[PDB]
Amino acid sequence: MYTTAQLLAANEQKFKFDPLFLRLFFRESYPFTTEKVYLSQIPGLVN
Amino acid sequence: MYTTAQLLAANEQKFKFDPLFLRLFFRESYPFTTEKVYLSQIPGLVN
Known part of the structure; x- marks a missing residue:
């Protein structure tokens, strides 16, 4: 019981995550x- | 008796002792x- 035993660390070390796809190709957003x-997409292919 | 001794410079002889570890990773100190x-360390793994 005489073991108060404070701690001095709260290390998370949780993730290695950075999308870069919502930033490099999908910069524009459009609410609905x-x-x-x-x-649509109109194709161009003539004789 | 008749000695007539003259003392010249002395030597030093200290260690080649530099921590590199109490200065690079262990910069922060706490008492008890x-x-x-x-x-403690929380395992950060969301779903």
Whole structure:
């Protein structure tokens, strides 16, 4: 019982994580108000 | 009796002792007030 025994460390050492994909290619964000979403792409290929 | 001794310079002879460890990693010091010491570390692993 005579073992008060304070500590002096709270080491987390938890992760090695940095996305860089929400920062290098996905810089622009667009909020929604509609349930459905369209994303079209017109191709160019002539005779 | 008749000696007539003259003393010249002396030597030093100290160690080649430099910590490099009480100065690089152990920079922070604490005293005690308890007997035992804990060292806790939380395993940070989210799901």
